[PDB]
Design a binder for this molecule. Structure first.
Ligand code: P3B
Ligand code: PLP
Lengths: 425, 418
């Protein structure tokens, strides 16, 4: 059984899962035996349609052979030597072609690593130390950015961090231009970087308000602060060239992962030659014995090569998302359950609202959205859905990540499963 | 050409390599086209015997099919879902079986990640903040440990670190029991952890002095400080159960990577249930979307499964190292070049000179410009090792007698050109 098999896992993995968040993501136990397309198989041989999809990398679904095969070939030809390799130029060139604001990169194993070195690059380059974040925006778990009352409160996110960890890190509310302007008027000249999820995906899928990214680019440019887009989720997802392209605003540095490597552990950060100058001279720092290994860069080449070869991909993904959005709206409407749904392409939040919530609200930030949401009922809904054979994360603020494997028929099954689950609510 | 192909790489990879250290590791350009066994193939189709081997993971050489095949099978069956998986228990159990001081683990993508979370666990568990390191010991590049690289001076290792990064990190010289005793007599009660390379591999291969690890275990135990063995390099390398087993001293936490995943990006940290209690309750923190992904844990299961099935492996690896050691000594003796060589199994340091117990003592004997010159010459003869004398060689089962005999010839020829 799932529950018994999870208990077995817990006797050797402290907490049941390596990541503290993802260990609370299966309150009705589910242990995977295999996966393909958008389908999981249980250790009880149950089939589950996955709307979470391993948190963003799988644009084409699980077990994508066009990418498996390339990575497996690399295992047969040397996957990790630590030396420069012919692939390094091909990976770099693909990223540069597809991403406007990137001409050079360095690779890492994870978004967390890529962010930490990107922030260091901004501090080293500007000779400043102060970094600005937004509430609910997640940039991995490195010591200077790991945050958990006002949105300007900076609260450490983990036990066992040094007390000064966040001394040079500051926070504002998402989509609050007045607050942002006031900050820059006071401290624009001390800011090394503003880091931001151009679309906030780790706390609902709150897109930026009209003009907000433009405003950020202006203030940062005027003040000499580097603008860092964390596109770990949005890159190669909301458009071929990420949110950068979709919203027509170019940052100084860009962090990438997820879709880039199709699920292989790999990330990068980069920008134009000017922003990357201290790394071109090897004066600034980045490291990691596995960084840019040959298997990882084969995965980038195969995945970005595949995406490049499909010039109408993002149009079809958009139809997929629209159809899921329309279907899920009908199912909740028919049941007379208020719901909030935000979508940017195949990135999608679905949250069940309180009976006392304003159905027509368009929250612009995490606090506004959280307040409308009925968390206990949503948790209860996802247990029910999981039993009906559909998995999404129990926290309403955690997004769904659709894929080309979520065809019309799949989405029609999802509808049925959600309908049945709501009736049990 | 190698040089032209590297220049192409540098137009899109800032600095030519993603890691700031490994971008200075090929001053005579070498770009890889393919690799297998202990052999590299150039973009000019040259063959090079690799003594560096990608910095530790490849105990059986490059392109190990018994491990390729398992990982490729995982790609066909779902490699990354973010959910608990049947493999998780098998990977955990294999580590627990092979490593004395580990009963539970969490996985990470890299030694740097695994270290950071391990140190946080020790701070959270003890309610203390102060961490002790040793000079020349490398624990990755996280904010609270990245030092440059007196022995007591704590110097930041990267530009753009917050100024307070190392405020709660302290350093002593390796193998200095007096200093270590004095530290603990004064501050034993404030120390959250002592982190240490049980064999110092990133600065020569300086093993611990007789009784030093035993002393560390006693002081940390007495003071309630967690002893953290960074076995990223030594684990499954110097013995099946790492330096832990080899030297009979058990730490509170162990960090693992490298050999564990056979070159797949994967790491872990773990200990006995007591030391891992705040992670069992999910009160302490670790994260990363790719942590413990199915491909990574398939690699751990295949690699550790293979090692487990070969109970005399570490004895054969010892013969391999002895033969390399004896051969290299003869070649330098015959040429009348003084050399310092330290070895622990297949971990091996070879430095050209102008028994040190620490980095300062060893560095002082070494002729760095001549060693750099020697490695350019060796590389041209078809043997690659890192140009810095303090960076170790990582031998493998693919370094057979014939290979080592070729290495001898190539080193002889290179010394004559010195
Ligand atoms: C925008 C963004 C992220 O979303 C991000 C990681 N996000 C997630 C990590 C989770 C985890 O570690 O278990 C789980 C997911 O819920 C989440 O999106 C990271 C950190 O990446 P990584 O997990 O590879 O360290 C950086 N930037
Ligand atoms: C002992 C030790 N620990 C940790 C690391 C860091 O692991 P990674 O390079 O995967 O971050 C290294 C790299 O040289 C190492 O030698």
């Amino acid at each position: 059984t799932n529950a018994e098999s999870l208990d077995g896992i817990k006797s050797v993995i402290a907490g049941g899962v390596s990541s503290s968040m993802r260990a609370a993501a299966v309150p009705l136990p589910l242990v995977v035996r295999s996966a393909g397309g958008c389908l999981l198989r249980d250790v009880e041989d149950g089939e589950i349609i996955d709307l979470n999809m391993g948190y963003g990398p799988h644009l084409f679904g699980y077990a994508d052979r066009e990418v498996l095969d390339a990575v497996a070939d690399q295992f047969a030809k040397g996957h990790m030597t630590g030396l420069p390799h012919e692939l390094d130029a091909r990976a770099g060139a693909l990223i540069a072609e597809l991403v406007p604001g990137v001409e050079q990169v360095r690779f890492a194993n994870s978004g967390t690593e890529a962010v930490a070195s990107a922030l260091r690059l901004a501090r080293a380059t500007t000779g400043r130390t102060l970094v600005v974040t937004f509430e609910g925006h997640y940039h991995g778990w490195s010591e200077t950015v790991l945050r958990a009352t006002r949105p300007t409160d900076v609260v450490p996110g983990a036990l066992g961090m040094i007390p000064e960890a966040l001394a040079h890190t500051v926070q504002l509310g998402w989509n609050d231009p007045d607050a942002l302007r006031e900050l820059f008027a006071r401290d624009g000249d001390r800011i090394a970087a503003v880091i931001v999820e151009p679309v906030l995906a780790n706390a609902g899928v709150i897109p930026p308000a009209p003009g907000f990214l433009q405003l950020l680019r202006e203030l940062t440019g005027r003040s000499g602060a580097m603008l860092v887009f964390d596109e770990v989720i949005t890159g190669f997802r909301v458009a071929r060239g990420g949110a950068q392209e979709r919203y027509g605003v170019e940052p100084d540095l860009t962090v990438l992962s997820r879709v880039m490597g199709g699920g292989f552990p790999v990330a990068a950060f980069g920008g134009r030659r000017h922003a990357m100058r201290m790394l071109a001279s090897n004066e600034a720092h980045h490291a990691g014995v596995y960084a840019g290994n040959h298997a990882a860069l084969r995965a980038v080449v195969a995945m970005l090569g595949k995406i490049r070869s499909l010039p109408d991909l993002y149009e079809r993904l958009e139809d997929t998302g629209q159809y899921m959005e329309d279907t899920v709206r009908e199912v909740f409407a028919t049941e007379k359950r208020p719901v909030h749904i935000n979508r940017v392409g195949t990135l999608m939040s679905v949250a069940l609202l309180k009976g006392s919530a304003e159905p027509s609200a368009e929250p612009r930030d995490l606090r506004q959205l959280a307040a409308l949401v009925d968390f206990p009922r949503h948790r209860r809904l996802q247990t029910l859905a999981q039993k009906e054979g559909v998995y999404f994360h129990p926290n309403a603020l955690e997004p769904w990540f659709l894929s080309t494997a979520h065809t019309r028929d799949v989405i029609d099954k999802v509808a049925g499963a959600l309908q049945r689950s709501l009736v049990g609510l």
